[PDB]
Amino acid sequence: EAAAPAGPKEFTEVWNKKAPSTLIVPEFPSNYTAVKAVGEGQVHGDAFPVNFYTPHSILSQAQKDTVVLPGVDGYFGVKASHVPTIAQLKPGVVELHSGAESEKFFVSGGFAFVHPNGVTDICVLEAATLDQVDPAAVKSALAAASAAQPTDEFEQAANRAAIELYSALESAVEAKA
Amino acid sequence: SNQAVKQRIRAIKNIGKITKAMKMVAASKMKNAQIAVEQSRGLVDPFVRLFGDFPAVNSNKSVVVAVTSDKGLCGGLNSNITKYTRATLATTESEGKDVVVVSIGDKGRSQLTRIESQRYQLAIADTYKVRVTFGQASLIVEELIKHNPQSYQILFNKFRSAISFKPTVATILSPDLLEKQLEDVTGNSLDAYDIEASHERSDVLRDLTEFHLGVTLYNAMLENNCSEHASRMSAMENSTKSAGEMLGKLTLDYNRKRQATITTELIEIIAGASALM
Amino acid sequence: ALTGLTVAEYFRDIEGQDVLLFVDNIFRFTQANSEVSALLGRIPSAVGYQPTLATDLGGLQERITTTTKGSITSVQAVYVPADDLTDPAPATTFAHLDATTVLSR
Amino acid sequence: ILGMDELSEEDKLTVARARKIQRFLSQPFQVAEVFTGTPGKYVDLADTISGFQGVLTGKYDDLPEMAFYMVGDIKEVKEKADKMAKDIASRKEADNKKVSEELK
Amino acid sequence: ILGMDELSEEDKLTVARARKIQRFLSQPFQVAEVFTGTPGKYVDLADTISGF
Amino acid sequence: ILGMDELSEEDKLTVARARKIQRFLSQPFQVAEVFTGTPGKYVDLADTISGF
Amino acid sequence: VGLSVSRVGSAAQFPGMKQVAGTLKLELAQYREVAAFAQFGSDLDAATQYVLERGARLTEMLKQKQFAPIPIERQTVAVYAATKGFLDKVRVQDIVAAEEAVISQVNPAVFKILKANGKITPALDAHLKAELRKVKLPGA
Amino acid sequence: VGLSVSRVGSAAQFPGMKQVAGTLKLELAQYREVAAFAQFGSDLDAATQYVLERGARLTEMLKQKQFAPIPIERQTVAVYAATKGFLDKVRVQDIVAAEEAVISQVNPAVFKILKANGKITPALDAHLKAELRKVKLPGA
C-alpha cells in the first residue's frame, strides 16, 4: 500500500505550513546524487558503472565490465546487466575488470548492491589491495586468534570474525596467478 | 585620560593580529579537511540510491541529532542549525510521537537544553579534537540505536563551498518499523532486489540501516567540521574588519586628544608666564 | 625658502620660463617659522605652531603660481608629524597642494 | 568586534530587550510634526510604566524591534507590528491600473 | 589565503592585466644611466594614454 | 580570546610555571600581620634562588 | 543623507518635489538598515534584495556632474521616475544615462505644467505616467 | 629591528656583512609579519613555519652579553652560520654548546682572511661551508 507519499518535495509544503518563511528549505542528500536506482540507463553496451567505496576513500568510479564480489554464499561475478541484488560481502577479494587490466582489492566485509538501472555499488569499510598487506603477520594473527578462544559470546563472535577474515586473507595472498 | 586610549589601541591592534592569524589557521584547516569531505561524499550516494530519501515520514519515535561545533568562533553556524532543528522538528512531530534530540559538539548542548530541554537525552562532544573517524561515528550510532526509534534525523551544514553552507537534513528509516512499509509500490520496490545474504531480509535490512546511519553520521560530522572551519575563516575576516575599523576610529580619537593635550599644556604655560612677565 | 623662490621668480617673470622649485621638507619651513615666532615672544597657536601659520605658509605658497609671463611649479617634500594628517602643519600645507606623489618602500 | 553569535543565550536576550527599550524610549513630538510628518504623541505616566513593565518582563519578545520605534504607548507597539505584517502580506494584493480614464 | 587555483578567470584577467600595468608604470631615467647602464626614456602624454 | 586550551603543552606549561612564579613572588610581611593575620617571613638569598 | 538636515526650508520646498522627495528620503532611510552588510557581514535575506537594488537606483539618481545645475521641474520628474518604479529594470551602471534619456525623451510640456502649477496635479500624474512608459531606457 | 633606521645604510658597512645581512633583514621582516602565528598550536602551512623557526633562531643569534664586543669578522661568520641554514636545526635544548661553538671551533685562519679581504670571496665560502659543516658540539 502506498497511501502516504513521503519524500523531499512533499516535505517542502509541510515545512512551508509549520515552519516560518524566514528560512529557506533545508537540503536533502538526494539533491546531491545524480544517479538513482530505477531511472534507466548507464549500461549502453557491455560496460556498466561501478562505485567502489570506503568511508575514507573513493576507490573507483570508472566503468568496468566484470566485477567479482565475495558474497556470503560465495564468490559471484557481476557482468553488464546483472539481476538487481543486495549482496552481503564476507572478507574476500574484490576484482575489477577493465579488459586485460584488473584491480584486485581485498576487502574486510561490507555490502554490494546491483541496481535496476545496471549500476553497481560496492560499500566496504576497509579495502586494502594485496601488496599493502604482509603475508608474515596474517599467520601470526591467525595463530594469536584461533588458539585463545574465550567462551563468552562477544569475544567468540569477535574470534569467529577474526578466523574468517584471517583465513580468507591467508587464502588470498598466495592465490595470485 | 590619554594613556587609556593608547592601551585600548594596543589591545585592538593585537586583537586584529590574533584574528588575522586565526583566519589563516581556519583557512589551512579548511584546505586540509576538504579532501576527506570530498572522499566521504561517495558512500552516502548508494544508500539514498537504494533506500531513497523520505524526510516527512509519520513515525512513533525519532532520534534527531544536530551536529554542532566544539569551539565557538564559527559565527552563526551552531545557532542556524538550532533554528533549522526546531524548524524541521515542528514540521515532523504532529502525530503525538516521542522525539529524542541529540547534539554532537558541546556548542549544541549549550543551545539545545533551553529550547527543547525535557526531550534532550544525549550530548556528544570532543569529536573533532584529534580527527573524525568511522569507528567514532559507529560508536555514536551505536548509542543512537541503544533506543530504537523509527527514524534518524541528522541536522548538519553541508559544505557546498567556502562561501555557502546549506543546512541539510538526512533521514534513516529503521528497517521493520518504517523502511519495509515506506517502499510498497504495488507490492514493494525492494522486492526487485535479490537478497544474497546469510539470514533473512529483516536482518540484512537491519545491518544496512545501522551501516547507513553510521555512514551518513560520519559524513555529517565531517561536512559540519569543514563548514565550521570555513565559517570561522569568514567570521575572523569580519573580526579583522571590525577591529581595523575600531582601531582607525580610536587612532583619530587619540590624535584629537594628543593635539588637545599639547594645546592645553601650552596654554597653561603661557598663562603662567603672562602673570609673571 | 623665500630666497629659493626669488631665484625661481627671476626665471618666471624675466626669463618667461616654466621653472621648477623644490622645497625639501616644507614641514621644516613651518617649524623654522614657528621657532622664529616663538623667539619673538608671540603666543603660540594650536598644538604648538605659530599663530601666523596659515599666513606664513600662504606668503610662500601664493607666490608659486602661473602668471602671464611664466610659471613656477613646486614639488614640496611633506613630512607628517606623528603620522597625523590633522596636525595643523600638514592640514595647512594640504590646502595649497594641487597633487600628491606618494613614494612607498 | 565579534558579532552577536558569540554572546551567551542569556545575554542575547539582554541585547534584544535593550534594543527594544531603547527604541521604546523614543517618541514623536507635536512640535517636530512639521518637519517629520508623523503626529506627536503625549504619553501618560501609567502607560509608560505599564509599557516598560511589559518589555522588561518579556511580554513583547514576539514583536519586532522597529514596532517600538517612534510610537506613543504599548498599544501602538502592537498596532505597528500589525501594520508591519499586513505590509509584507501586501506584496501581492493587486496590480494597480486606472484605464479608460483620460476623458473623465 | 587560497591561491591562484580558486581564482576565477574573470578574476585572473584582472591579475594578468594589473601585473603588466604595474610593470608598465616603471620606467628608466636619464639621470640614472651613468650607473645603471640602460638609457633613460622620455614618454609623451599621448603615448602614455595610448600605451595604457 | 582563545581560552588556553590549544597551546600544545609548551605554552600551556609556561603559563602554569609563570603563575606559580607570580604567586611565589608574594610574601607575608612582619609589619603586615596586623591587617592580614598571616605571620611574616624572612627568606634568605640562597634560600630563594633554589626555590625559584 | 543621515546627518544633513534642513528644518527651515522643509516648509519652503517646491511642492511636487515635496510630494516625491518625502518618499525618497523614507526609502533612503530604510536603505540604511542594510547599509554595507547586505552579505558582507553574515547573511543575505533575498527578500530585502529589493531595498538594496532600489536604494542603489536612488543613490545613482542623485549623482550629478559638476557645473550643471538642474531646474527643479526637471528634478522632480527624475525623482518621480526613480521613485514610482519606472527605472527598476534599468541596470545600476546606466541609471545616469537613463535619467538624461528620461529628461530628453519626455515632451517638454509636462515641465512647463509642473513649473507653472507648482505641484504634480491629479491631471498631471496620469499624463506623466503616460509619457514615462514610452521612454527608451538604454540597455536592459 | 623594525623601528631602527640607518639613512647611510648599506653603503657604510662591512662588505662581508653586506652580502649576508641583506638576507637577514628580509628574513627578520618576514618573521615580524608572521610573528602573531608563533603562539598558535595548530601548525600552519609549513612555509610560515619555516620563517617562524628561522627568524626565531635569527633573533637568538643577535643576542649579546654586556661589555664583551665582538670583532666584525666573527659576527660575519656568525651570521653566515645562521642565514645559510647551518644553525641548530636539531631540537634547541642545545643552545649554550651551539651559539659560540662556531667561533670557538672553526679554525682562526678564516677570520684572518675575512678581515684582510673584507669580503666573503669565492675562494673562501667553500672553506666556510666546509668548516661550518664539521662543527663538533660535544655537549650532547
Question: E-strand spans in B68-144?
Answer: 98-104, 120-124
Round to whole Å and give the CA distance between B230 and A45: 43
Question: Do B228 and B30 meet the contact criterion of CB atoms below 8 Å apart?
Answer: no
Domain spanning B1-24+236-277: CATH 2.30.30.40: no
Cell digits of residue A162:
577474526
3-state secondary structure of G44: coil
* Interface residues of chain F, partner chain H, Cβ below 8 Å: 6-8, 11
Q: Rounded distance, CA H48 to CA H54, Å? A: 10
- G58: containing domain: 14-140
Instruction: Report the C-alpha gap between G7 and A108 in whole angstroms.
Output: 82
- DSSP run (H or E) holding B170: strand B165-173
Nearest CA-CA distance, residue F11 and chain B, Å: 16
Specify the DSSP class assigned to residue G46: S
Give the F:H interface size as CB pairs under 8 Å.
Answer: 8
The whole-angstrom distance between residue B105's C-alpha and the CA centroid of its chain comes to: 8
Determine contact: B37 vs chain E, CB below 8 A: no
CB-based contact B235:B163 (threshold 8 Å): no
SS3 category, F33 = helix
- The residues, any chain, with a CB within 8 Å of residue C17's CB and separated by 6 or more, are C11, C70
Question: Can you tell me which residue has the cell 637577514?
Answer: H24
Annotated binding site of D: 35
- Alpha carbon distance H55, H24 (integer Å): 9
Q: Is the CB of residue B84 less than 8 Å from the CB of residue B64?
A: no
Q: Say whether B103 sits in a helix, a strand or coil.
A: strand
Q: What is the CATH number of the domain that holds G48?
A: 1.20.150.20
- Helix, coil or strand: residue B102: strand
Asked if residue D100 belongs to a domain, the reply is no
Residue A160's nearest CA partner among A69, A70, A152 is A152
Residue H7 designated active-site = yes
H/E segment holding residue A162: helix A153-173
CA distance B209 to B52: 12
Touching pair B, G by Cβ (3+ pairs < 8 Å): yes
Q: How far apart are CA G124 and CA G118, in angstroms?
A: 11
Mutate: best of F11, F12, F13, F15, partner H, most H CBs <10 A: F11
Phi, psi angles (nearest 5°) of residue B245: -70, -45
Give the cell for residue E15: 591579475
Please name the amino acid found at residue B7: Q
- Contact check, Cβ <8 Å, H36/B14: yes
- The answer to whether the CB of C89 falls within 8 A of the CB of C49 is yes
Tell me the binding residues of F.
35
Tell me the backbone φ, ψ of residue G139, rounded to 5 degrees: 75, -150
* Catalytic center residues of G: 7
- Cα separation, B237 vs B231, in Å, equals 10
Planar angle of CA B101, B107, B111, nearest 5 degrees: 55
Locate the domains of chain A by residue range: 37-133, 134-173
Indicate the domain borders of chain B.
Answer: 1-24+236-277, 25-235
Residues in chain A: 177
The verdict on B25 touching F (C-beta cutoff 8 Å) is no
3-state DSSP percent of chain E in helix, strand and coil, to 5 = 50, 0, 50
DSSP, residue by residue, B233-246: HHHHHHHHHHHHHH
Q: What is the residue type of H125?
A: D
Q: Is G75 annotated as a binding residue?
A: no
Q: How far is B238 from chain C (nearest CA, A)?
A: 26
D101 part of a folded domain: no
User: Shortest CB distance from H44 goes to which of B17, B18, B25?
Assistant: B25
Please, which residues 29-48 of chain G have a Cβ atom closer than 8 Å to chain B? 41-43
Question: Which chain G residue shows the shortest CA-CA distance from D91?
Answer: G47
What DSSP line would sit under chain H, residue for residue?
A: --S---SSGGGGS-HHHHTTHHHHHHHHHHHHHSTTGGG-SS---SSHHHHHHHHHHHHHHT---TT----HHHHHHHHHHHHSS-S--S-TT--TTTSTHHHHHS-THHHHHHHHHSS--TTTHHHHHHHHHS---TT-
Elucidation method: cryo-EM
CA–CA dist D35, B185 (Å, integer): 70
Expressed in Å, this structure's resolution amounts to 2.9
Could you tell me the residue range of the domain that residue D43 belongs to? 1-93
List C-alpha distances in Å: C47 to C43, C53, C88. Answer: 12, 11, 7
Helix (H) or strand (E) holding A122: strand A120-123
| Contacts of B117 by beta carbon, 8 Å cutoff, 6+ apart | none
- Neighbours of C, requiring at least 3 CB pairs below 8 Å, are B
Count the alpha carbons within 13 Å of G116 in the hemisphere toward its beta carbon: 7
CB contacts, 8 Å: B92 with chain A? 14
* Rounded Cα distance, C90 and C72, in Å: 21
Radius of gyration, CA atoms only, chain E: 16
B259/C84 Cβ within 8 A: yes
Torsion angle defined by CA atoms of residues G15, G17, G20 and G22, in that order, rounded to the nearest 10 degrees: -90
| 3 state SS of B173 | strand
Cα–Cα distance, E29 to H117 (Å, whole number): 35
Cα–Cα distance for residue pair A51/B46, rounded to 1 Å:
9
Rg (CA), chain A: 21
Residue of E nearest to B21 (CA): E1
B23 chain-E contacts, CB cut-off 8 A? 1
What contacts H125, CB < 8 A, 6 or more positions away? none
Torsion of CA A139, A144, A146, A152, to 10 degrees: -150
| DSSP letter assigned to residue C44 | P
Distance in Å from the first CA to the final CA of chain G: 29
Question: What's the CA gap between A47 and A119, in Å, rounded?
Answer: 10
Q: How far is G121 from chain D (nearest CA, A)?
A: 14
Q: Which positions in chain B touch H40 (Cβ < 8 Å)?
A: 21, 25
Residues A20 and A66: beta-carbon distance below 8 Å: no
**What is the 8-class DSSP label of residue B123?**
E
CATH code for position D72: 1.10.1140.10
- Closest alpha carbon within chain B to G42: B76
| Whole-angstrom distance, CA of residue G82 vs CA of residue B208 | 62
Q: B55 with B169: CB under 8 angstroms?
A: yes
- CA of H1 vs chain B CAs: smallest distance (Å): 19
Q: Which of H31, H34, H39, H40 to mutate to test the interface with B (most CBs of B within 10 A)?
A: H40
Secondary structure of residue D9 in the 3-state scheme: helix
Distance from the Cα of residue H31 to its chain's centroid: 14
**Contacts with B236 from chain H: Cβ below 8 Å:** none
